[PDB]
Short mmCIF file of C-alpha atoms and ligand atoms in Angstrom, two decimals:
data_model
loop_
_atom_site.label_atom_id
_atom_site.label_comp_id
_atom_site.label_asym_id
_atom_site.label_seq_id
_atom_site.Cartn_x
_atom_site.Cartn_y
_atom_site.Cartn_z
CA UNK C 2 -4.25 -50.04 0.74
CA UNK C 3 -4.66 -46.35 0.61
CA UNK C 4 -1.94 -44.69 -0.85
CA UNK C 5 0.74 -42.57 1.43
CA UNK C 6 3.91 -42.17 0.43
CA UNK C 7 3.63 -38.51 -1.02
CA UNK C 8 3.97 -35.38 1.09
CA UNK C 9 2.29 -31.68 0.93
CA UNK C 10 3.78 -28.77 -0.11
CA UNK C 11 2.23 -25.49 -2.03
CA UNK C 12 2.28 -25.67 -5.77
CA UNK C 13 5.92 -23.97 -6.72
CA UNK C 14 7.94 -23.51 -10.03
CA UNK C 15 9.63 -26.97 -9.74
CA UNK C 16 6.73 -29.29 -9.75
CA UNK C 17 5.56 -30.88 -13.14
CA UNK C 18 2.15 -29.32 -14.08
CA UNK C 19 2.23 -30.57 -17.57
CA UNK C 20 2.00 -34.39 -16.55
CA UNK C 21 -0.92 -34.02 -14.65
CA UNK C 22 -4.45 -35.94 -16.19
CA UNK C 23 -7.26 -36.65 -13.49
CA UNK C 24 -9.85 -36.83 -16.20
CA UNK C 25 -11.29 -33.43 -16.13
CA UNK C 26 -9.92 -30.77 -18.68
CA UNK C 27 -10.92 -27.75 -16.47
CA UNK C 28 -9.33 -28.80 -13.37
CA UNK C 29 -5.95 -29.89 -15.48
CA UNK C 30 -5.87 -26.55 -17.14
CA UNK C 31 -6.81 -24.86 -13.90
CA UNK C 32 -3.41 -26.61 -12.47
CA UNK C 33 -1.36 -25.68 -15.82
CA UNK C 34 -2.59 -22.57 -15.97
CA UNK C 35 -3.61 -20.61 -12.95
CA UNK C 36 -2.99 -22.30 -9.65
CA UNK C 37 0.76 -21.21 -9.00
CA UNK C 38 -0.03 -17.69 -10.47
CA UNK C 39 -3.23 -17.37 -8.59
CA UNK C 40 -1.15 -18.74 -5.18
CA UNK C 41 1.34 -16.02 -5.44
CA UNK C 42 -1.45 -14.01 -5.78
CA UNK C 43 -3.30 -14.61 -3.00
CA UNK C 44 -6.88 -15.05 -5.07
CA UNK C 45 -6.79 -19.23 -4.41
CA UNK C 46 -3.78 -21.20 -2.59
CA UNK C 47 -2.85 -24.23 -3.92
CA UNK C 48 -1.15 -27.31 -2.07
CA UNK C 49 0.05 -30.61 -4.07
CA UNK C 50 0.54 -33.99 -3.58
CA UNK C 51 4.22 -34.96 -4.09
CA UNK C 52 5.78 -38.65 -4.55
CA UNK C 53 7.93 -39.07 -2.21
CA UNK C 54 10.65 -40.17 -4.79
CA UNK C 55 10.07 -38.03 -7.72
CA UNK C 56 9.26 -34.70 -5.95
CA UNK C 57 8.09 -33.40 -8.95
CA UNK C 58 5.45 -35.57 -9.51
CA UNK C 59 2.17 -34.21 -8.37
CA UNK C 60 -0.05 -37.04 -7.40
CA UNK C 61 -3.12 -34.71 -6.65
CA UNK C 62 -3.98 -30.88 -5.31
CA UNK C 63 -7.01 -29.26 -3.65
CA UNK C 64 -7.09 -25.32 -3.91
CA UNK C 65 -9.22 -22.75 -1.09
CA UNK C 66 -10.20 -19.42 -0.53
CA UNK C 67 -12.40 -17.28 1.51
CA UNK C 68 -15.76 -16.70 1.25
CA UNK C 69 -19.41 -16.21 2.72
CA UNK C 70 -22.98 -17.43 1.69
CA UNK C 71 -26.41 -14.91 2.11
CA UNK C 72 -28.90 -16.60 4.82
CA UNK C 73 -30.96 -17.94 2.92
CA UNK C 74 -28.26 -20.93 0.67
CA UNK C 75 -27.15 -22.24 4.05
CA UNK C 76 -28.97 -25.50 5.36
CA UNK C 77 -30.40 -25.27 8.81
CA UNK C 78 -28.57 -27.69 10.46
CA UNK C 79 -25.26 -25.47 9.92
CA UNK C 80 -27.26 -22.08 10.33
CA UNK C 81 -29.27 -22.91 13.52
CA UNK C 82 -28.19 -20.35 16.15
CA UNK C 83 -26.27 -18.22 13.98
CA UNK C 84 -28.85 -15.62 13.06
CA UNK C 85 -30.37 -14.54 9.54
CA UNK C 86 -26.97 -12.74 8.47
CA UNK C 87 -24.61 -14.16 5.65
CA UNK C 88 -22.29 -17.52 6.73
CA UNK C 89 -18.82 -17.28 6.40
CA UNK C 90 -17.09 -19.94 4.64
CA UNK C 91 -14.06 -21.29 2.86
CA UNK C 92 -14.71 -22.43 -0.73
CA UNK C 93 -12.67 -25.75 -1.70
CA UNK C 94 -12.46 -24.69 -5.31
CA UNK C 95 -10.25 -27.31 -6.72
CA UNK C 96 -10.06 -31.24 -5.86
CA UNK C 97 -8.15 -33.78 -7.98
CA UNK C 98 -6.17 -36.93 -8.19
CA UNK C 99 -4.67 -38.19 -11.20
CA UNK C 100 -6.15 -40.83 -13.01
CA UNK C 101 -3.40 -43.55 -12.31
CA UNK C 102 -3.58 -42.94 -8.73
CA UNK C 103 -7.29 -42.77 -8.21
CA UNK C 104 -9.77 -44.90 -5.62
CA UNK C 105 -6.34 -45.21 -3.54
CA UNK C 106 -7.60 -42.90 -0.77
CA UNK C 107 -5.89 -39.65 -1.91
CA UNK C 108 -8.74 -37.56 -2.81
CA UNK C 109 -10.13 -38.63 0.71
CA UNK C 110 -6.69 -37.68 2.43
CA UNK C 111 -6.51 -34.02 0.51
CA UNK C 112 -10.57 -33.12 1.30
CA UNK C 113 -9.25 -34.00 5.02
CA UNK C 114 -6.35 -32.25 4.63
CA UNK C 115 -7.65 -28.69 3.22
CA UNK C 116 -10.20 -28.82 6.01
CA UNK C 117 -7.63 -28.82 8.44
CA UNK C 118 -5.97 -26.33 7.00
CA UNK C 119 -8.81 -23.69 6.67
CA UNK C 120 -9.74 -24.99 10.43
CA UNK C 121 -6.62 -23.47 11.51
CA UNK C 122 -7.03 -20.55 9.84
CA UNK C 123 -10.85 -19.90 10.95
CA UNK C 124 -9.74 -20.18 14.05
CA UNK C 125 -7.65 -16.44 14.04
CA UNK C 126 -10.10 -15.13 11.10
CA UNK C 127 -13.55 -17.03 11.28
CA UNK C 128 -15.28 -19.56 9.03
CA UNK C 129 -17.70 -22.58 9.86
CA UNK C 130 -17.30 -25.06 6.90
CA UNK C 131 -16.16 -25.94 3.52
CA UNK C 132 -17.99 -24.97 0.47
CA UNK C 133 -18.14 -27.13 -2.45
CA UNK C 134 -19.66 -26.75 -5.82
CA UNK C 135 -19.82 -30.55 -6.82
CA UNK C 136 -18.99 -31.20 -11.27
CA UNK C 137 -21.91 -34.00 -11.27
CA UNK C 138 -24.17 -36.15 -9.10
CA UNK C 139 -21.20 -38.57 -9.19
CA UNK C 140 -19.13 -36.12 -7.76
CA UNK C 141 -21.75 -34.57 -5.30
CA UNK C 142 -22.12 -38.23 -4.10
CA UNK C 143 -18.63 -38.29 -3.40
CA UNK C 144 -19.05 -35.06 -0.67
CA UNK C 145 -21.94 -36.05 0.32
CA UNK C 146 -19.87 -39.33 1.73
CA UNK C 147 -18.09 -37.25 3.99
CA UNK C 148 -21.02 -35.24 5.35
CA UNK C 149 -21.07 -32.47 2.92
CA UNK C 150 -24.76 -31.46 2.66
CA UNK C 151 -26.35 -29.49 -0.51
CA UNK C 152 -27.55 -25.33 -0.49
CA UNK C 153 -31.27 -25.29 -0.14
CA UNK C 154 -31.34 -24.14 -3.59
CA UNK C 155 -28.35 -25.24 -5.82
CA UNK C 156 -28.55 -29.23 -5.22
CA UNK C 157 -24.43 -29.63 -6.44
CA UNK C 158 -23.32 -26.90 -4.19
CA UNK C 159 -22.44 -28.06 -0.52
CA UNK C 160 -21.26 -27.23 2.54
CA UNK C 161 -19.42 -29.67 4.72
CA UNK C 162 -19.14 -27.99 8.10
CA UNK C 163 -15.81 -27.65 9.88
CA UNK C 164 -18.07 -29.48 13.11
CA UNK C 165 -18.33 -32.96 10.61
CA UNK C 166 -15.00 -32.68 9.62
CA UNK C 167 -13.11 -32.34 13.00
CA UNK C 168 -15.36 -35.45 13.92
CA UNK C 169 -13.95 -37.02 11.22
CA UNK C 170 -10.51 -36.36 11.93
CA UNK C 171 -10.95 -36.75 15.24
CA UNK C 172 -12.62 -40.08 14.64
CA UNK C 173 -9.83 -41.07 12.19
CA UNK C 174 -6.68 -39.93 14.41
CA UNK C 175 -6.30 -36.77 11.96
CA UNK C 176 -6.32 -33.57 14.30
CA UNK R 3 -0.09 7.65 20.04
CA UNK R 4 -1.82 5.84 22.84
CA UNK R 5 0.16 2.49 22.66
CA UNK R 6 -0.42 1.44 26.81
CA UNK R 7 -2.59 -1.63 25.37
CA UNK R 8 -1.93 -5.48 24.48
CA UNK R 9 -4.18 -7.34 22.02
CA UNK R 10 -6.26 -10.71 23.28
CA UNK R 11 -9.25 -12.32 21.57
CA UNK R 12 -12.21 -11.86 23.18
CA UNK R 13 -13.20 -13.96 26.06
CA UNK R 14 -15.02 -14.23 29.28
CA UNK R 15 -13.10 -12.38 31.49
CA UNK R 16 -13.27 -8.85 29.84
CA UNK R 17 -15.61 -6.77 30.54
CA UNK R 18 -17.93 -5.80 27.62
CA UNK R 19 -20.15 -3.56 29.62
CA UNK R 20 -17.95 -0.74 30.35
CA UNK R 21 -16.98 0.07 27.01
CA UNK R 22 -18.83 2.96 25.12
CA UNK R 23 -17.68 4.21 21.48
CA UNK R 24 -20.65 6.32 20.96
CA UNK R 25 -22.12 3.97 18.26
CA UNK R 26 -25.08 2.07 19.96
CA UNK R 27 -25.36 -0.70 17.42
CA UNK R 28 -21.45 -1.57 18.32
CA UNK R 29 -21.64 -1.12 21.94
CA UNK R 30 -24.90 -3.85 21.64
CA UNK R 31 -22.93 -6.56 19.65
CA UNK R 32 -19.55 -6.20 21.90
CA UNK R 33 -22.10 -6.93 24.56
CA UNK R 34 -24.50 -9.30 23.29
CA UNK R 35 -22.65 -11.33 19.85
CA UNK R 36 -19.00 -10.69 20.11
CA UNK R 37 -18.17 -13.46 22.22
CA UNK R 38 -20.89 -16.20 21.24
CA UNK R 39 -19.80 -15.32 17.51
CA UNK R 40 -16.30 -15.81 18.15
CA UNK R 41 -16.60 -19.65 19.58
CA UNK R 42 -18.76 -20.37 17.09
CA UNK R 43 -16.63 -19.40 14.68
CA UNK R 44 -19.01 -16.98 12.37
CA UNK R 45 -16.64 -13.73 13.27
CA UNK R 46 -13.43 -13.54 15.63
CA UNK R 47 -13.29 -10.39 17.73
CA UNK R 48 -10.34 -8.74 19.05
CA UNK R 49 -9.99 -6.39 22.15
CA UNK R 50 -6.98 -4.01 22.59
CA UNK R 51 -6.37 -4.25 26.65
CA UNK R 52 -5.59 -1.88 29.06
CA UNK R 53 -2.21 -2.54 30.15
CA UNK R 54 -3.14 -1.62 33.68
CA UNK R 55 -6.40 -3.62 34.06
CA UNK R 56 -6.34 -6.74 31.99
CA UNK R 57 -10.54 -6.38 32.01
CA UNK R 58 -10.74 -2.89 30.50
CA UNK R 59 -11.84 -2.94 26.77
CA UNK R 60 -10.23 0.26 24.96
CA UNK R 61 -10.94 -0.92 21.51
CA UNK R 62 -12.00 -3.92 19.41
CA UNK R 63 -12.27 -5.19 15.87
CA UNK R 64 -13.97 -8.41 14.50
CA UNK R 65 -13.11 -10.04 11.03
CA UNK R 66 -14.69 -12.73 8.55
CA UNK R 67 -13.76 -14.60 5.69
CA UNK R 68 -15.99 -13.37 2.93
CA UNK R 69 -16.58 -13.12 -0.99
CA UNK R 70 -17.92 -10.45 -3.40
CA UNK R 71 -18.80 -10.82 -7.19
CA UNK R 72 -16.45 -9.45 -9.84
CA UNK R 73 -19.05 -7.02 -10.92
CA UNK R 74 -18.56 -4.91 -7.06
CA UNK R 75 -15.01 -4.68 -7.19
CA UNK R 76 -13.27 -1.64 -9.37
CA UNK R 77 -10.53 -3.34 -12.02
CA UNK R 78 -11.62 -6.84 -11.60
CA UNK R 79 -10.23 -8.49 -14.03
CA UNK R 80 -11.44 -12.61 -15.02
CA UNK R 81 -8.95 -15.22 -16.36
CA UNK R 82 -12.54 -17.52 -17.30
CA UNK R 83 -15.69 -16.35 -19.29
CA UNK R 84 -18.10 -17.21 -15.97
CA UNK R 85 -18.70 -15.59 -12.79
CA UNK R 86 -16.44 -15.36 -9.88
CA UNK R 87 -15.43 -13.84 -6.42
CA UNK R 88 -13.07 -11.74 -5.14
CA UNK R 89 -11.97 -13.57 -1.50
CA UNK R 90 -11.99 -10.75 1.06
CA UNK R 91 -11.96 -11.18 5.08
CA UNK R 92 -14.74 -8.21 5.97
CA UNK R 93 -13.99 -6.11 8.73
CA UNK R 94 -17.07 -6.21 10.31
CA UNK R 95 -16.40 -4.04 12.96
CA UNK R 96 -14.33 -1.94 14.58
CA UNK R 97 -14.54 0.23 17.69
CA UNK R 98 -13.03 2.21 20.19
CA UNK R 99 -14.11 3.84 23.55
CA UNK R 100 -15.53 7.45 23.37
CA UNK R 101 -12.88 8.32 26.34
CA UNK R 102 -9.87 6.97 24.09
CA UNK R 103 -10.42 8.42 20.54
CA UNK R 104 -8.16 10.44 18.32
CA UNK R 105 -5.36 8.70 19.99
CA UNK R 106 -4.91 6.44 16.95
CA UNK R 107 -6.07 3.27 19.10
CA UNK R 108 -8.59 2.77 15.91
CA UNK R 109 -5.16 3.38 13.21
CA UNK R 110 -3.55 0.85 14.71
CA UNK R 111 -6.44 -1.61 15.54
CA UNK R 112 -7.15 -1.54 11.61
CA UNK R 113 -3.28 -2.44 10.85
CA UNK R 114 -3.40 -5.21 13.19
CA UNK R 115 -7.02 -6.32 11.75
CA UNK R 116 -5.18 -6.12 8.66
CA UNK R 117 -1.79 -8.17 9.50
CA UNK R 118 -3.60 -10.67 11.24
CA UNK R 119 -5.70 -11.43 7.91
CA UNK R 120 -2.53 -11.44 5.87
CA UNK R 121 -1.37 -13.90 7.90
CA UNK R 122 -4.16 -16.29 7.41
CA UNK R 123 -4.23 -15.39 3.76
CA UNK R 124 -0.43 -16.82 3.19
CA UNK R 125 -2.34 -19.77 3.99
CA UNK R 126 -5.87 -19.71 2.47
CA UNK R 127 -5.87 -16.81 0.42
CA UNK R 128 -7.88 -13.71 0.26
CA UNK R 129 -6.63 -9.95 -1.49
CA UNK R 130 -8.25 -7.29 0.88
CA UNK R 131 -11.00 -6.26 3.71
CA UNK R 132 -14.01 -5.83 2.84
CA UNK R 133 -15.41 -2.40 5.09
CA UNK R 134 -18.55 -1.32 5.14
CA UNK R 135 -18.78 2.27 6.41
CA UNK R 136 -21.08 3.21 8.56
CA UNK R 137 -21.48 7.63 7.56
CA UNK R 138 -19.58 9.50 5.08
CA UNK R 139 -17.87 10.80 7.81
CA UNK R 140 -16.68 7.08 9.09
CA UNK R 141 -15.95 6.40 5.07
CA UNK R 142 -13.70 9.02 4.95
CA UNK R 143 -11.77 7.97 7.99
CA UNK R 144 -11.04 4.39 5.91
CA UNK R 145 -10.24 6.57 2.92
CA UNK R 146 -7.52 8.31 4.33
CA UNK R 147 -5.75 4.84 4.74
CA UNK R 148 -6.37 4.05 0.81
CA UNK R 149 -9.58 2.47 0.98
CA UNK R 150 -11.54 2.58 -2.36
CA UNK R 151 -15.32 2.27 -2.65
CA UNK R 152 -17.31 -0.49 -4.58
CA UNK R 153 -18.70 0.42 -8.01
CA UNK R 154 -22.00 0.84 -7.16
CA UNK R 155 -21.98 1.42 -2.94
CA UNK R 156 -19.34 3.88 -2.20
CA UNK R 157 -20.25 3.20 1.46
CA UNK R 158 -18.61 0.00 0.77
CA UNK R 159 -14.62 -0.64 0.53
CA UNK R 160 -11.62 -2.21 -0.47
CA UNK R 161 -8.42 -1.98 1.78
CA UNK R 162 -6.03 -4.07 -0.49
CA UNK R 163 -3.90 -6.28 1.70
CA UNK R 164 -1.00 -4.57 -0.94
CA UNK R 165 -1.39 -1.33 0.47
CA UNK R 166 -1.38 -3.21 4.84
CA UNK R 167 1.58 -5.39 4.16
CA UNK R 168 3.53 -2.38 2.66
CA UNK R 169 3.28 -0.50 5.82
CA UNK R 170 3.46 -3.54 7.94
CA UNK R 171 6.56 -4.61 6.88
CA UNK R 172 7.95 -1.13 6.66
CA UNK R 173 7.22 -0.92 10.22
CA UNK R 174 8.78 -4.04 11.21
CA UNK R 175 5.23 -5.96 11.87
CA UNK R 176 5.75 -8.46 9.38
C1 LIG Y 1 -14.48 -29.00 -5.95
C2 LIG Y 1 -14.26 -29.74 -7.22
O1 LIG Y 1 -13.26 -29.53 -7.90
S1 LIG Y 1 -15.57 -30.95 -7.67
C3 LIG Y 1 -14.60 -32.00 -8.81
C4 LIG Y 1 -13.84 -33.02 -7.98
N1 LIG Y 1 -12.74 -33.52 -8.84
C5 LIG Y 1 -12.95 -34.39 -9.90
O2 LIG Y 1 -14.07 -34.82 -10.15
C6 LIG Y 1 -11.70 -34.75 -10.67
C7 LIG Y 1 -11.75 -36.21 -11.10
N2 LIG Y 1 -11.72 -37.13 -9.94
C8 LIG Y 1 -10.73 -37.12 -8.96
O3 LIG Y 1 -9.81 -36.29 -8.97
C9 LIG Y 1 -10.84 -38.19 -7.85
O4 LIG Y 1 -11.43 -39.32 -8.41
C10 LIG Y 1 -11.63 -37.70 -6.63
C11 LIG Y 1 -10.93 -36.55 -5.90
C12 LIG Y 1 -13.06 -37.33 -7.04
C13 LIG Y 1 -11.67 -38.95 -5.73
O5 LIG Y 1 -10.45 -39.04 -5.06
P1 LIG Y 1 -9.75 -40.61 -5.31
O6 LIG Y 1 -8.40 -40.53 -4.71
O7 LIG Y 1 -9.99 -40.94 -6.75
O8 LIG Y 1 -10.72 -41.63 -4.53
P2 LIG Y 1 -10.86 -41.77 -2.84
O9 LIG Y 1 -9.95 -40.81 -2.18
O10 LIG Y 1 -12.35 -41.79 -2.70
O11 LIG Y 1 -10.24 -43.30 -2.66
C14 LIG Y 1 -11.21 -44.19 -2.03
C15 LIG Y 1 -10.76 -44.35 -0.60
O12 LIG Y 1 -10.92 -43.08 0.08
C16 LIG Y 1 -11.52 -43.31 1.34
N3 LIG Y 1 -12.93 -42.90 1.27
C17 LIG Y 1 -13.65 -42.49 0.15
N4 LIG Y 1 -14.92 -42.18 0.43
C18 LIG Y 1 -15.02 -42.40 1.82
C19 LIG Y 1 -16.08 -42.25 2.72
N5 LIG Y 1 -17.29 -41.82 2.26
N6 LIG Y 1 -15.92 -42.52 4.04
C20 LIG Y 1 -14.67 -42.94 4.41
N7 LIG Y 1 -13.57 -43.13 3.66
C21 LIG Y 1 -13.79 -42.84 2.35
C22 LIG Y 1 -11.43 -44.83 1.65
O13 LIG Y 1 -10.19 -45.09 2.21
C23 LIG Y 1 -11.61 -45.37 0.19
O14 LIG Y 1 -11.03 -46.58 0.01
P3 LIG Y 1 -12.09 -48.00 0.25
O15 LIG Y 1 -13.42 -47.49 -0.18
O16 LIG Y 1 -11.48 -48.92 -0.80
O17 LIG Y 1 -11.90 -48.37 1.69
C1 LIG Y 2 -16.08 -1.32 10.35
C2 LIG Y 2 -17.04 -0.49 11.14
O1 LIG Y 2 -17.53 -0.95 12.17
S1 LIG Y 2 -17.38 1.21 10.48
C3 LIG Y 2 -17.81 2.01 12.06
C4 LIG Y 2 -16.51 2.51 12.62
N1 LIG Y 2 -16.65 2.65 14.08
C5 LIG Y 2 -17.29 3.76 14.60
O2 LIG Y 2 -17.74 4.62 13.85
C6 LIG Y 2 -17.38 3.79 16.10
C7 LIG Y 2 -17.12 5.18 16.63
N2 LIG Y 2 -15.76 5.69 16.29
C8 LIG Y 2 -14.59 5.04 16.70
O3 LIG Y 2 -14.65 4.01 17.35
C9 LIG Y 2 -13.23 5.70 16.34
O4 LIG Y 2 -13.43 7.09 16.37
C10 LIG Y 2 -12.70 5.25 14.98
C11 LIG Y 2 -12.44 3.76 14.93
C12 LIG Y 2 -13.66 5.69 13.88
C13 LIG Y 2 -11.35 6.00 14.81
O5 LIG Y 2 -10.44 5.45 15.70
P1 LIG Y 2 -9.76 6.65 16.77
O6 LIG Y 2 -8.90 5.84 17.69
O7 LIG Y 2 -10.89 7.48 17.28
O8 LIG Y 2 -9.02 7.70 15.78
P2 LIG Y 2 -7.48 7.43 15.07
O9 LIG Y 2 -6.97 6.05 15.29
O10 LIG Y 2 -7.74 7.99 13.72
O11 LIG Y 2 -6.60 8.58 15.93
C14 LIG Y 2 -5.90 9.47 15.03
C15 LIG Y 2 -4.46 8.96 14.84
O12 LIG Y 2 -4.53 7.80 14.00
C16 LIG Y 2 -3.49 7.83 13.07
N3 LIG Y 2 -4.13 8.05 11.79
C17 LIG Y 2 -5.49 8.30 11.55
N4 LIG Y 2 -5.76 8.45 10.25
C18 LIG Y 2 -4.53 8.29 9.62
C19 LIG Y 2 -4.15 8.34 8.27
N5 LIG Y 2 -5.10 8.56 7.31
N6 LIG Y 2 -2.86 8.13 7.91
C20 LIG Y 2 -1.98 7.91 8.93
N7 LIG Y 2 -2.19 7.83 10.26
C21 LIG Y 2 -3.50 8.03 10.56
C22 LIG Y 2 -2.54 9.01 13.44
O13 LIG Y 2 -1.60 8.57 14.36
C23 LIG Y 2 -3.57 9.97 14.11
O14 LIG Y 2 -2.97 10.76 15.04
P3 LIG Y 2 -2.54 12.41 14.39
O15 LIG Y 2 -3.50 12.69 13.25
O16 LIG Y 2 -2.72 13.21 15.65
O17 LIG Y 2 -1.11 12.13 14.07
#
């Protein structure tokens, strides 16, 4: 049932931004708005979801950058060992599927799919997990399925760490 | 220019105990952290190799991915109302033996710290390296390369990855 006939590419001028709805205003606008800019950029890269028919459709994105956390936000079970010095990170800023296509295992696929891509990177520049600040409890929930695990402080920020998520794709045939 | 060298990440056949750059902080974490960091994954460290004696350690550099708040960085400018960051990969440090300096082992260690962040950049962004200087006299040394301080810690700086690619590509490197 879960939904793969689309392929990944960076966001780029021929893609159709406009016809994009996953529900959320701020994350449509961000698409129609900033994400190719900010991609050429450099300040947040940007990969979509394309139909495998109509390559302009854009079934879903996820967005990343780099970025670090002071000491004292980082859980202990992703600090341990690392000594009481700020945690580098990559910050999944963006997540979405649009509404038609939801619950069919593409938001699942494209969380997957940007932590392998910052794994790769982190492993030429550094970086030990995702970092995720979640909309709503709904949404937290949702990381929280996949390991993610909240700041000790801010209870909708989280950090899923790049050692759950190669389990995970190891477990699921993904690496 | 001293260019007898090869670039490898660190690993557990160099040796980190002959290596001295006069700085007793750096000699401590090439020793001690460098390696342990880089498989866990909190910093990657590179060593610049004798080309005579794969073990000897001329040089190295170590880079993160990293953040700072709009309100550190000179002409940050917001497309939203709210706070944000600035993605950076710090150079955390960089290093070269006492017996090997002014030979511009430490120029060209910086351009490959630089390229090799770039690189990951085209793939999960990030605008600049983040330095923090150790003395004015180590601040100035990044300034002569067009680094440019923080608002309010001008041991702090910016090397925009604008400024690395232009002489990277101009010298065939990328
Ligand atoms: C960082 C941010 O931007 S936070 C904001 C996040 N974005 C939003 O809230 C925008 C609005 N919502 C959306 O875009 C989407 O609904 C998302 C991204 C939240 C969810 O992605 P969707 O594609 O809708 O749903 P999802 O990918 O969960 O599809 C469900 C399938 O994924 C997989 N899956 C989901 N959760 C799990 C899990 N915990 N363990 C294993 N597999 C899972 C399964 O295959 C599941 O199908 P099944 O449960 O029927 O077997
Ligand atoms: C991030 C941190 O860790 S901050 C702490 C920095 N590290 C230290 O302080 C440790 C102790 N010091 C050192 O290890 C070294 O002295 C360093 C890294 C500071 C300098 O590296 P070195 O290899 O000693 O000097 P450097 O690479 O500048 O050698 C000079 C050559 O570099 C090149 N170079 C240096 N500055 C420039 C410049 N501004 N523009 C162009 N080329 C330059 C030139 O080829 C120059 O040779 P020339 O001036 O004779 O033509």
């Amino acid at each position: 049932s879960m939904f793969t006939d689309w392929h990944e590419a960076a966001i780029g001028k021929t893609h159709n931004r406009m016809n994009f709805d996953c529900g959320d205003a701020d994350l449509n606008q961000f698409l129609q708005r900033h994400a190719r800019q900010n991609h050429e950029k450099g300040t947040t890269k940007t990969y979509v979801a394309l139909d495998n028919s109509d390559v302009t459709r854009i079934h879903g994105f996820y967005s990343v950058s780099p970025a670090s956390l002071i000491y004292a936000q980082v859980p202990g079970a992703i600090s341990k060992g690392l000594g009481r010095y700020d945690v580098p990170v990559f910050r999944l800023g963006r997540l979405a599927v649009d509404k038609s296509m939801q619950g069919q295992g593409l938001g699942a696929q494209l969380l997957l799919s940007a932590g392998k891509r910052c794994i790769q990177a982190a492993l030429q520049v550094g970086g030990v997990a995702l970092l995720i600040d979640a909309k709503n409890k709904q949404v937290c929930d949702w990381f929280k399925g996949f390991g993610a695990v909240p700041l000790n402080d801010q209870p909708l920020s989280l950090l899923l760490s790049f050692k759950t998520l190669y389990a995970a794709l190891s477990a699921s045939g993904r690496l």
